[PDB]
Structures are given as C-alpha cells and as structure tokens.
C-alpha cells in the first residue's frame, strides 16, 4: 500500500491549512472547524471516528486529525515533498521492524 502510493481504505483526514480546532458535536453530526486568521474549511466525519486533537489546539497543515493511514498525496499538496518522504520511509520501516 505504501510502495504503490494508494489512498488507504480506511483513511485519516488531514488539515489543509493552519488554524485552531473548534469541535461541534450534534446527535447526528460531528463536524470539526479548523479556524485560521483569514477564513476556514469544515470537515464532516462519521460519528464514532477517533480524533487526535484536543479542542482548541493549534494544528499545522498536514497534521492528522483522524486516526488512520494518511493518503500520501493529500500530504504532498499540504506539506511538500520532504514531508511525504519522511512519512513513506518511516511507515514502511514500521512494518519491517
């Protein structure tokens, strides 16, 4: 899955830009706002999904919000080549180790 650069089947959502996390939990919804100084994008997730972020936390661009495998391509647009190289080499080594 790593050597072929495939979007994982159960994949985590990563933040596109910087901001601070503001949680919203409805009975039927679990939207998450990452709020920057200019404007902000909203990510709607399944209700039972696991989160890595406490509320009101500062998240860099390309930081996993969800638990799951990162899509290497989403990461390439957000963080640039060196960040993807870091992710691939370590994630491969995880299995072999």
Distance CA 30, CA 44 (A): 6
Instruction: Tell me the C-alpha distance between 28 and 31, whole Å.
Output: 10
Resolution for the entry shown, Å: 3.1
CA distance 63 to 56: 15
Residue 80 token pair: 């640039």
How many of the other CB atoms lie within 10 Å of CB of 19? 21
Residues 6+ apart with CB under 8 A from 58: 18, 19, 20
Cβ distance 47 to 27 under 8 Å?
Answer: no
CB atoms within 10 A of CB 34: 23
Q: Are 20 and 57 in contact (CB under 8 A)?
A: yes
Structure solved via: X-ray
């Amino acid at each position: 899955e790593l050597f072929e650069a495939r979007r994982p089947k159960a994949k985590a959502v990563i933040s596109e830009i910087d901001g601070v996390v503001r949680i919203e939990e409805t009975e039927e919804k679990l939207s998450v706002f990452v709020e920057s100084e200019g404007f902000s994008k909203e990510y709607k997730l399944p209700k039972e999904a696991r989160l890595l972020v406490k509320d009101g936390d500062y998240v860099e661009a390309g930081q996993p919000l969800t638990r799951g495998a990162i899509d290497p391509h989403q990461l390439l647009e957000a963080k640039g080549p060196e960040a993807v190289e870091r992710y691939l080499v370590e994630e491969i080594q995880k299995v072999y180790r």
